[PDB]
Design a protein around this ligand. Sequence first.
Ligand SMILES: NS(=O)(=O)c1cccc2c1c([N+](=O)[O-])cc1[nH]c(=O)c(=O)[nH]c12
Lengths: 99, 50, 41
Amino acid sequence: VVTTILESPYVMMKKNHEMLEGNERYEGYCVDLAAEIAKHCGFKYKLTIVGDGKYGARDADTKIWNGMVGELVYGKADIAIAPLTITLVREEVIDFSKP
Amino acid sequence: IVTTILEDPYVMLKKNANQFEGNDRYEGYCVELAAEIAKHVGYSYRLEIV
Amino acid sequence: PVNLAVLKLSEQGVLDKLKSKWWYDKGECGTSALSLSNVAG
Ligand SMILES: NS(=O)(=O)c1cccc2c1c([N+](=O)[O-])cc1[nH]c(=O)c(=O)[nH]c12
């Protein structure tokens, strides 16, 4: 399972998405970046969009994470290849790769 | 123990290095970086050139 | 503790102030009409 997020330049939905089911529905930089990763990694990728439409931030009241970050900690998502900023609080909960 | 190399504004020996002892025998950028992290993590250090 | 300390320094802005000091603060450097000097003669 590969969790991503909808952006303008990164993850775009292609024209005639109804006539192409699977990984042909999307096209962009972040799609090809995942293919480069799976060139040297033994993993099967499925383009799964996060339902919330959020990057990840722990709310003040609930004290619980959401989106791609929320799916990582609670154990649903496997890998996340998306424009995600590497900050202090994220490193405490989930491990990050090199920039 | 800290391992480092001498090159330009990162690490260079202090003025009148003859009359200096320990960490007060060096000055630069990485000098100040070594000082900051040692406090936040919590251990005393000793600078040494490669 | 070191990896997180590096992130603690960067986000708050310790490195950026320190980089300003040793490069610039400790440094020793620093209309297109017809000018007056061209006609001065
Ligand atoms: N759309 S945006 O104007 O540029 C933009 C604005 C504000 C926050 C963003 C953000 C983008 N982004 O590039 O899509 C990614 C991103 N990733 C994170 O992890 C995060 O915390 N905040 C952001």
